[PDB]
Structures are given as C-alpha cells and as structure tokens.
Write a protein that binds this ligand. Sequence first.
Ligand SMILES: CCCCCCCCCCCCCCCCCC(=O)OC[C@H](COP(=O)(O)OCCN)OC(=O)CCCCCCCCCCCCCCCCC
Ligand SMILES: COC1=C(OC)C(=O)C(CC=C(C)C)=C(C)C1=O
Ligand code: SF4
Ligand code: SF4
Lengths: 157, 313, 92, 28, 80, 384, 96, 67, 174
Amino acid sequence: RSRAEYVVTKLDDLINWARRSSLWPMTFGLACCAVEMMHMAAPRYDMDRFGVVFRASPRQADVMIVAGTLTNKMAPALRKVYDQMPEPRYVVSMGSCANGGGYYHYSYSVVRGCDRIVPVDIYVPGCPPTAEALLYGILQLQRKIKREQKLKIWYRR
Amino acid sequence: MFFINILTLLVPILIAMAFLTLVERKILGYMQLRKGPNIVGPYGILQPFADAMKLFMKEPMRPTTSMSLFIIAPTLSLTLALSLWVPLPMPHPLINLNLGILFILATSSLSVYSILWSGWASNSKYSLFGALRAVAQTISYEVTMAIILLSVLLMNGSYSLQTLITTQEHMWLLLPAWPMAMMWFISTLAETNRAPFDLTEGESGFNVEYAAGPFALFFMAEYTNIILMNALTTIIFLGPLYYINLPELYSTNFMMEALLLSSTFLWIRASYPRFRYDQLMHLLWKNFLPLTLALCMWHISLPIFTAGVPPYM
Amino acid sequence: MNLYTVIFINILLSLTLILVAFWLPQRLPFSMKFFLVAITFLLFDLEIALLLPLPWAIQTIKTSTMMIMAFILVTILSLGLAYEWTQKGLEW
Amino acid sequence: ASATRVIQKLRNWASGQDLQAKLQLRYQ
Amino acid sequence: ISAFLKNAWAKEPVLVVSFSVWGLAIIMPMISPYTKYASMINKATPYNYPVPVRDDGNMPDVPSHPQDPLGPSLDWLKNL
Amino acid sequence: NMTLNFGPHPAAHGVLRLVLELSGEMVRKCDPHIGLLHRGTEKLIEYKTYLQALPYFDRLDYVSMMCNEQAYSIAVEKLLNIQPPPRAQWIRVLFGEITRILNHIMAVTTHALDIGAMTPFFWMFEEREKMFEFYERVSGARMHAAYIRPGGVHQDLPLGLLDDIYEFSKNFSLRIDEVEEMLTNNRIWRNRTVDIGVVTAEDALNYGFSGVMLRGSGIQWDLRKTQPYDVYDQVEFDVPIGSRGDCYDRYLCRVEEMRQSLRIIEQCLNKMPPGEIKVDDAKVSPPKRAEMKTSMESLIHHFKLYTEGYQVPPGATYTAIEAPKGEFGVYLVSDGSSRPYRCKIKAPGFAHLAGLDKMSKGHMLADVVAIIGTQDIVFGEIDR
Amino acid sequence: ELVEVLKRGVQQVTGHGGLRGLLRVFFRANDIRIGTLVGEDKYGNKYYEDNKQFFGRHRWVIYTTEMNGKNTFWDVDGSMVPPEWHRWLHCMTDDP
Amino acid sequence: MWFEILPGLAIMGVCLVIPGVSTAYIHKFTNGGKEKRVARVQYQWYLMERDRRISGVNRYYVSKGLE
Amino acid sequence: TYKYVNKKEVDMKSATDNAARILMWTELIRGLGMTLSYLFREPATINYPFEKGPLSPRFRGEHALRRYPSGEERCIACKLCEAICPAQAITIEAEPRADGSRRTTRYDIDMTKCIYCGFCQEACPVDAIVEGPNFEFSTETHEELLYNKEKLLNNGDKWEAEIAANIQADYLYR
Ligand SMILES: CCCCCCCCCCCCCCCCCC(=O)OC[C@H](COP(=O)(O)OCCN)OC(=O)CCCCCCCCCCCCCCCCC
Ligand SMILES: COC1=C(OC)C(=O)C(CC=C(C)C)=C(C)C1=O
Ligand code: SF4
Ligand code: SF4
C-alpha cells in the first residue's frame, strides 16, 4: 500500500519495536528492592534475555527503575539523574516504598512516592516486588511502548 | 569494480561487527548460566540491529559541551578502525602497502586522540580525568606493542603484511616468538580497552557524556577494532595455511582463527577482575618492557648468527 | 588514489552516521607522573623511530656494525629505563 | 544435564571436579 | 649469590629472563658457526647490475659466458 | 585535592555521597555522607506495637533479612523473660545461617562486580535464588519474611523443606569452590585486594568495628561463641580468624564462614527436635486459629494480641547477635506499654563506614571501591 | 551420541505441526520443545509439562490468539493464564 | 544449551570470509584472469608498464612467443 | 574453636614452579577453564511468560476479600485487620446493613502503602482478607493501585478457587 497512513504506521511500529526490544535500564538501587532486581539480572530470570542490559549509565539509559525509599535528601538527585537521560526516557517505580511511601510513608524524611519527583510510567507493587513481578512490569512497559504512535500523530498534526 | 571491493571489506565487516556484540552477550551469558538475548528475532540475530535503531533515535543529548570535538571524536574512532581494515591481507589485501604494518601501527596510534578529545570535550571535572587514563595507557602499551612488531618484522624481512604469508608457509610464527605472542595478545587486550585492561570506563570515562549516535560510533569502532587486532594476531603470529591455487582456505582459516581469538577476549572479560590503573602500567613498564626490549635484541641476533637474515622483498 | 577512494568512503560512512544521529531524533595536574610517563613515551617513541630502519639495515653488508650499533641503542635506552626504576620514577 | 558424555568430560576436565554430582539443574 | 638468583627466579621472574636473553643475544653472535655467513649471504645477493670490465688482458675474470669456471661462487650458499 | 563528590549511581548501595578530595588519582581524605536512606525506622517504631514493628527489622539490613529479626526477637523475649520453644530455636539457627550464606554471597559477589569480575555474581545469585525459595516456602515472602517473631517462629516448616535445605547444602559447597577457582588465587584479585585497607587489631577494637573486620585483623571474637544466643551453643563451628588483615584476608574469612555455616546448617537438619514453634503463653504468642475459633479464652487472647499488644514489662536491654555483617544490637527501652519507647538499632556498618577514612588513606580511586566492598555496607542499617 | 542429539532436534522441529506451526511457536516463545498436553483451558491456552526438564522449565503454557478477543498472538501477557491453572503453572499444586 | 551461540557466530564468520574471497576474485576478474601483479620495487613496475606498452592497453594482456 | 584462613624453602623445583606460575600465567588459565566448563552447562533461566518461577501456598502476593460459599462476603468489619496493619494501609468504616448484620461500607487497601507483611491474613477471625497468589498486578496509574471493596471483592471472586486451595493446604500449619 502507498496511502501514507499505511506507510507511516508501519514506520512507527519499527521505531517502537527498536525501543521496546532494547531497553537499557539504570538502577538507582535505593533500599532493598534493588536486591530483588539483581535477581532479575541473575540467571533464573535473565533480564538480558529480553534485551534489558544488566547495567547502564544515565546517558545511555532508556528506563530508570526506582527501587527503594526515595528519601528527602536523595530526592534532588533522583531528579537530576532523570533529567540527565535522553529524550525517549521512562520510569518504572518498583516497591511499595517508591510507588507510594510504603511502611515509611508517614516518616519525615521519606518522599511519599517517586511520582512526586519523577513522572512514573509503570508502578510495580510489593514490598520486595517479586523479580518475576518486576519482569512483568518491564514487559508491560514494553506493551506501553508498542502502543505509542508518535509519527502518526505527527502526520495527523 | 574497485568500489564493489570497498563495499565488500566494509559492509561485510560492519555486519560481522554487529554479530560480535550478540556473540558477546551470549557467550558471556552461557558462561554465567543464562541464555543471553534470544527473544528478539530468532536466537537473538535481530538483537544487534534493534538497539542500533534505539541508540540513533534517542536524543544526542549534546549535553552542553564543545560541539565540534564531540563530533570529531566518534567520527575519528570509527574512521581509523574501519580504515585499518583496508590493508589487512586476508588472502590478497585490498590496497597493498609496502610499509603496511607501519600503517596499522600509525593508524592505531591516532585513536588515542579520540579518547583525549572526547574527555576534554565533555565538560566534567571527572570525565576529563577518565580520558587521561585511556590516553596514558594507550601510548604506554603502544611502546611495547611497537617493539613486539619490530621483533617480528626483523624475522619477516619487511613491513608489508603480505610477506608473512610467505614467511609462514611452513610454520606459524607462534612456535618461534611465542613469548611475544602472549605479549602481543595482552597488549591487544589493552589497546582495545577490553576487560583485564579496561580501567577506563570501568566507572570513575569518555562515553560518560556520550549517548545515542556518538556513543554508537565509538562503540562500533571498539568492536571493529576488537576484531582487527585479533585478525592481526591471526596473520602475524597464527599464519593461516596459504595455497596459491585456492585463496579462500587462507580466508576460511583466517575466519576460524580470528573468531576463536575474538572469542578469547570475550572469554577473558567474563573470567577476570579488572586490573588497577597503576597495576596496569606496572605490568607494561616493569613486567613486559624489559622482556620485550631484551627479546627485541634476541631477534636481531637470532637472524645474524643463525645465518638466517630474512630476504628483503 | 586507490587508497584515497577507500578513505573518503570511510569518512563519509562515519560523518553519515553522526549526522543521522543528530538529524533523526527530531583542574588538578597532580600527576606529573602522568607527565613523566608521557615524557618517557616519546623518548621510547623516538627510540623506536631509530629502531624502525633495522629491517632494511639487516641486509647491510657490514652486519657486525649493524648489530653493534643496534645492541648499544637498545642497551642504553634500557639503562634509561633502569634509572627510571631506581629513583622514585615509574612508581607513579 | 543431557551432557551426552563428551560435553560432560570437557566440562569435568575444564572445571577439574565432577559437576555431574552437584548439578545446576534441580530435578525431582 | 645463589639466593640472589633463586628468589629472583621465584619472585621477579621477568627481569631474570629479561637479562638472560639480553646476554644470550650478546654471545651467540660472537660464538657461532654461521655468523660469518650473514655478511656474505647478504653481500652476495645481487641487487645492482654487475658492470663488466674491459679485457686489457691477463685477467682471471670470467670472460664471456658467466658460466666460466672462474670467479666467485655461492655454492657456500647452496648446500648451506 | 579537588572534591569529586564521587558517588550517587556509583558502586555503593545507591547512596554514598562520598565526597572526596583527590590529588590526581590519590585520595587525601574521604568524608562519607550518610542519610541518603534515612527513613525514620527508629521513630516510626515508637508509634507501633511490638509485633507491627517486627517487619521494620527485616528492612533495616535486608540482605540479611532474618538474622536481624532474631535480634529484635531475642530482645523482646528478654524483656518478657520468655524464651522460645526448642524447635523454634533450631529453626532460627537454621534460617539464621542460611541467611549468613545469603549475605556472604551478596558481599563476595557484589565486591567482585565493583572490582570488575561479573561471572561470580551470576553463578551464586542462582544459588541465592534457590535459597530465597526456602524463605518463601517457609514464610511466604522471598525476602522480608517476618517469620522470626518475638516468641519463636510464626509457623512450622512446611512438610518437606528440611529435605531440600539438604539437597542444596549438599551441593552448595562445590559452588563456593568454583568461585574460588575464579577469585581466591586469581593473579589479579589478589593484587587489587591484598594489602588494601589493612586495619590494626587495636584500631579495629577502638573504632568499634565488631565483625569480620575485627576477626580479619586476628582478634578472636564471635558473639556466637563468646555469648551464645538461641542454640548456637549446641552446634560446633570454627570461627575463621585471619592474619595480615587486608581486603583479601577478610574475604577469605567470609568464604570460610560460608563454609562453616554449611557445617552448622547440616547439624541443624540432623538434630532439630519435634515440638512447637511458638511459646505456649497466649499472653505473648498468638493463639492457634483452630483454638481461637473454638475457645473463648483464645479469641480474647487473639483479639487483644493483634489489636493492642504484648504489654512488655518496663525495662531496657541491649541484645546483640552476630548478624552476617557484624554485631547487630537493639537497645529497646520499654515502658509497660504495648508499643516500645526507644529502639536504637546498632548497625554493624555505622562503625565500619566511619573507618573508611582511617582505612583508605593515600589510596587510589579504585582502592576506595574495593574498601566499601570489604565492609559489606548496606545503607539501610547505617541510615536507619 | 550427538547424532541422537540431532534426531532429538529434528523431532522437536517436526513436533510443532508443520513448518508454519513451529515458525509460529518459534516467533512468540523463541524456544522449541515437545511435551505432553496436560490441558487446554476455556480461554484459549495450551499447557504442557515435561518431567525430564529442570524444575524451572518443566511446566510451560503456550498462550493463544484472542483469549478475550485482544489480538494476544504477539503481546503475550502473564495475567492471561486463568486463576485455576495459575497455581499449576507456578508449581503451587502438583495436581493439574 | 551452548548450541545457540553458533547462530550469531555463523553470521560473523560468513561476514569475515566474504571479504577475503571477495577481494581475491575481484582482483582475478579485474586483472584478466591473473592475480593483480604487485609492483613493490621500480623494476616490477617497469616490466608492468613495459608490458602495457607492449600490447593493447592493459598489462594482463600478455603477448607470447607468437609475436 | 578458631581457624587461620591465611596464616603462613626456596628450591629450584619450588622456584622454577613459582616462576612458571608468574611467567606463563598458569593460574589465570585455570580460571578460564572454569568458565568454559559452565558454557557447556544447561542455562537455568525460565521463559518468563511461558514458564513461571515456583511459588508455594503461603506466597502473599495480592490482597483479596473472600466470600462465604453461599455468597455473603466474609468480612464482618471487626476492623482489627486495620488495627494490626503496620503501614496504616487498610481503611475501614462500617454501618449495620439493613439485614441488621454488620458489614463494611468502605474497605480500602492502599497497596502502595501496603508492604505485604501478611499479618492481615493472620489477624482476620473470619479470614475474610487473604493474601492471594497473584503477584502480577502492575498498573499504569497510581490511582489503580489504591483498591476499594469492589476491586478486592472482584479480586476475591476471580482467584477464590486457588485461594481456597492455598488456604486448604496451609491451615493445619496455622
Ligand atoms: C633460547 C631461548 C630464547 C628465548 C627465551 C624465552 C624464555 C621463555 C619465555 C620467557 C617469557 C615467557 C612469558 C612471556 C609473557 C609473560 C610475561 C609476564 O611476566 O607477564 C606479566 C604478568 C606477570 O604477573 P604479575 O604477578 O602481575 O607479575 C609478577 C612479577 N611482577 O602476567 C600477567 O599479568 C598476565 C595478565 C593477563 C590478563 C589476560 C590473560 C589472558 C590469558 C589467556 C590468553 C593467553 C595468551 C593467548 C595467546 C594466543 C596466541 C596469540
Ligand atoms: C555492593 O553494592 C551495590 C548494591 O548493593 C548490592 C546495588 O544495589 C547497586 C545498584 C546496582 C544494581 C544492578 C541494583 C550497586 C551499583 C552497588 O555497588
Ligand atoms: S518497598 Fe519493601 S522492599 Fe522495596 S524498599 Fe520499601 S521496603 Fe525495601
Ligand atoms: S479482619 Fe477480616 S473480617 Fe475483621 S475486618 Fe479486617 S477483614 Fe473484615
């Protein structure tokens, strides 16, 4: 087909496939939910298998997984690093301590959620969110990206 | 034709360059009890193309920093590495140069700048220092790297890489000169900033501020080099059998030896912790340079008193 | 020329990639050791340059003088190294 | 498992001990 | 002195080998049944045309066909 | 000495604003910053009842999830002058040790990842994984179990766990052996680790190191042998003391306690008694659900225990165990109320970090990375 | 030895119906293996268990297209498996 | 098993033999069926160009005893 | 009982042995052999969507509110599940239903606040609130994670068959 609509959608998809197949994460590793992510990186549940690299610096990172309490002192940093990433960037909040406040919600030093400091795309629940659950959450980010249609909106704009 | 012969010798290497990252992310995997990337495409074959497209699409942040240099550094890194494949004598070379190994030594030396330029270009008190590590080690390892070749040449008779195919028609230059092979292999590991010798960028260099397209170009460069240096080991020390009647068994064995030695630095990476910055220079200036300079003299003496001075040409 | 053709394709391929990259996504000098190393490097480099003619010089009719010369050069530089290893040099 | 008796021997020779006795694959 | 060489061979086992080679390369040339050949084998290799001299007379130079039994020979190079 | 504010994502557990002044590649002074993970754990506990503050202890240093719980347990049991039942004690030592392995696999393999060796982590994280599964099949959670409660364990082991904690133990050794063939004698591990961060014996006691860090310097102190807690007295193990204390020696010590813990686990499986897993005082331990659903005194005791609490007698105690990192102690001051008054958690780690300054002196940037590893710093315990 | 290894690979490829059938399994899972079919649930799903494989991979479910009309052939989701068969897949209960 | 690292390698190998076979047949087809002569020293060029001047306008064309 | 982890003649045989170790990197080659060995071992990873990591009956996972077979929801609003929740997650307000029985008008578990301790599972007398097996409930928006009575009751109805099997397996233990 040559209708430019079918010409575009297809192109967008390719773009989405590339970003969704290779997501390079970065793990601030606040707290413990970091241990449950290292497990994902580990052999039972290989993250790489999916195209997720075990480690990445902020410049080269597609997704930031905030694992653990985002305390008030670390809150300015989180932002900095979120602000130091590329134009196509995403945030997967991991842990009840970062989805909301978690056990430490009423504390004076804990931000009640990272979505008060960085926009969050997928919220993975559980105190130590199971590694399979993170993997489920990373896979749902992949379905979120697949649906994104950036060029078709350009074309229809 | 010559143009076609430029596509071949380039694309083919670029496509192979992409498949090395994949065979790195799987061989490291199986060594660490994990499948590695197999879900995108079949058995992960489409995996290298996928992040290439993700890398180019993401914003070349160009943080900000001196721009021109930020764009000369990756261009130089890819240009020199792909350029050094121009003279490799896989069977017949493409551009046969009478002083070929000096071309390879000189072109490698120029890549140290890209590290220096990228480090200065990012405006980071810390990144700037990171480039220093690589630039210093590169020239350092270059000093033994060059002397090790001079020992070789004196037993080959010329600087042209094409002569070694005639020097190694009866035995690999590993049998003789094995002591330097090892020292060429370790130096090849340093100059490609691979693991045992990858302090640079271990944490603490010249990719710090580099993302998307610039990241990719050096990136591509490193891996192409990873191959090229391994290929130079597979011509200078492991001489593939050459039959003038059928030139491809030379390239077939060149293919096999290059892949195995390329596999070896992948295997080295997973197997060893990274050396300390001074530990690294302690090796070259203390452990290797005295060995190399002395074995250099032995290779000016072996020819003369064994009446084996090599035939020029 | 033949080489020129290859090289310009080489630069073109790299300049093409950087462009695509940009167009598609629409002070302490404490280590004088650092400096020291680098001084050594050229002294060694320059030395290499003196050793680089040895492949042509092997075929020199003299031979005795060749080796006598080459051995002296390698030995005197190595002693330079040796003295780098006697004081607090090369110990960063 | 499924060593085939040759990959297992390369495994045993390279490791220097018998992994067959203490495998990474848990079984019933 | 034995220790100066037995621990220096156990620890520091590079400089020992390094020096040893330095020397062995400084000796073999002096003592060898072939060292002399290098200056000959390379001397013989004919690179520049051998210009012929006028035959004033009474000379041992190979006249005519170079194959004449007179002159220099490289049978030493052959069967070397 | 240009401050590099070296730190946050660095090579620490997320938070180390390790601000440092470095003349080129030499470290002149290290002033670690802390509190990037302060969360209020000590103040929050004052507003919670004893049983609802048990989950906080698992989060204090969560690599060592349970061993921490044992310290609060012991502390609350002392204040009540109640002691667990015999089977529960062995359990706590069984899962106490399994947890030590889990911590050491974390400490040794994460140490290497920062050094640059990455294959040991994947090798042993698979073994870790297998252990987590024990936790899950005993507690319900992979980590953060809440299994060791103030009066014993929560629920008896599933019918079949012991057998599997055997198969694993029977093999884990080889897995430690492998790591060894990769790092103990690597021609390169030794260099980056040997003679780095040597700590004298007198200085280690002075800065309150109290852990492998002391044991590595040759001081012989294992709170598990000196002051036995639970039934660690009935087992027989050898403390792995070290000499020429340095990063390499202490490491060897941590690999050796992984080995000694397998000796303690074996015994616990061989000699765990038949019995109950929680004190029979409905006053302290919640009544069994069949009982609370058929007996009035049990419902009343279930209702009051869950809604109000233990009501510990007024007093204060400092009880210290030998958590994998080092001495983990809870100073729990308590009024007669059901909710505590103070609960300072002594973290093996607040003392160790402080030593970073006196350990990493005249050292390169890479040395600092090696020393943070040899202290097993989990910022949860330090920040609390 | 390896020839029997090769025959096992051939049977796995022939096992998934035709060339097109294995291509379908190949693309969505990236793993080819043959197992007895324990059950097919009413939402389209097929479950297979092999005793020989290690504990992690001996039970697998091959998801089906449109189990609630969602075009699920490519966007496979963990939640698609029904609650009854969830515990069998996670090894919570041995019984199918 | 480790079987799978082979796919990727195959595509590397195949992409490292092409170049060596390609350069060594685009020479034997752009030099009249004969290896491309290697002019390393002035004399090899002379005979190379002398030959050009000998016949046709290309060196591979080699006039024989029948000339 | 203590042990010395690292507490410690020069013979040609010995030295030559030691020098070879430094010169030809013998121990380094030993390390390479170990990794080559595993390269040949079967990888332990599981196809995540197709094969799932095993979780036994006590796995806490995601909250659900059960109902009596008859169909009457089990919760009778005693509200001690609220009392023992460590995170203050569960909010319950109740009033007598017209039937005269006691039921919760609003039961809200804030899952982002919840730290999945499993005490609520423990505390309930009628065992109305249970830790359900599902762990995969990741949500695009924060509001979805907050759960009211209708989501939990719906969660309870969906997973009741497995929840009943899980409680069946572990109740003797409790
Ligand atoms: C008449 C006879 C005349 C000739 C006489 C010859 C005498 C026998 C030969 C003598 C020299 C043999 C060895 C030469 C190479 C080794 C030189 C050396 O000493 O290595 C340096 C270093 C030493 O280790 P370290 O403990 O740091 O130093 C102790 C002393 N300070 O070692 C290292 O740190 C190595 C670190 C390596 C990291 C990567 C390891 C990769 C291993 C696998 C690849 C091995 C090479 C494969 C080569 C393939 C073919 C090219
Ligand atoms: C030993 O310390 C470290 C951690 O704790 C184990 C981390 O979580 C992290 C975070 C990294 C991941 C992959 C969670 C880093 C970098 C680290 O150095
Ligand atoms: S959520 Fe549970 S696990 Fe994740 S950080 Fe907060 S407490 Fe630690
Ligand atoms: S305890 Fe069980 S019953 Fe009582 S309120 Fe909480 S949920 Fe409803």
